[PDB]
Amino acid sequence: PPTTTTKKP
Ligand SMILES: *[C@H]1O[C@H](CO)[C@H](O)[C@H](O)[C@H]1NC(C)=O
Ligand SMILES: *[C@H]1O[C@H](CO)[C@H](O)[C@H](O)[C@H]1NC(C)=O
Numbered sequence: 001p002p003t004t005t006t007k008k009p
């Protein structure tokens with residue numbers, strides 16, 4: 001399913 005990525009600090 002639609003996954004999401006996190007923005008690196
Ligand atoms: C969400 O994470 C999955 C993990 O395999 C995929 O990398 C997918 O391309 C990601 N979706 C987006 C929009 O970056
Ligand atoms: C990607 O972002 C979505 C936004 O709702 C969620 O926070 C999800 O948990 C995130 N995925 C990761 C691996 O942090």
Ligand SMILES: *[C@H]1O[C@H](CO)[C@H](O)[C@H](O)[C@H]1NC(C)=O
Pocket residue numbers: 004005006007008
């Ligand atoms: C998560 O990382 C992916 C990797 O290309 C994309 O840069 C995406 O825009 C990122 N998501 C957020 C919320 O920064």
Ligand SMILES: *[C@H]1O[C@H](CO)[C@H](O)[C@H](O)[C@H]1NC(C)=O
Pocket residue numbers: 005006007008009
């Ligand atoms: C986005 O933040 C999450 C929160 O733990 C993870 O560290 C993930 O590895 C980060 N993504 C990037 C591209 O640094």
